[PDB]
């Protein structure tokens, strides 16, 4: 499994994050029905839920740093080969 995890604005974040957390916690929702739910829930979005869009994104970026950094071609030698 090498599917990458990039930071994005609220809409995508809630789509990916909710799909992840809900699919694991309530297994039988994990497909198009989730997609239908989230779209509907988005239209009825309450401002209190606005903030976790951004916070969930912060965790997604944390998932990104859990992977190897952008460490590039060593100058001559690298003590982390």
| Backbone torsions φ then ψ of 33, nearest 5 degrees | -65, -40
Q: Give me the count of residues in the chain.
A: 81
d(CA 27, CA 50): 25
**Where do the domains of the chain lie, and which CATH numbers do they carry?**
1-81 (1.10.30.10)
Burial (0-12, 13-18, 19+ Cβ within 10 Å), 14: buried
* Positive or negative: CA dihedral 62, 64, 67, 71: negative
42 touches 18 (CB < 8 A): no
Method: NMR
The region that residue 10 occupies, defined by phi over 0 for left and psi between -120 and 50 for alpha, beta otherwise, is: alpha
């Amino acid at each position: 499994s090498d599917r990458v995890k990039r930071p994005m604005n609220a809409f995508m974040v809630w789509s990916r994050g909710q799909r992840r957390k809900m699919a694991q916690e309530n297994p039988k929702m994990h497909n198009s029905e989730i997609s239908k739910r989230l779209g509907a829930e988005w239209k009825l979005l309450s401002e209190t839920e606005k903030r976790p869009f951004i916070d969930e994104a912060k965790r997604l970026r944390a998932l990104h740093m859990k992977e190897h950094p952008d460490y590039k071609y060593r100058p001559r030698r690298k003590t982390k080969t």
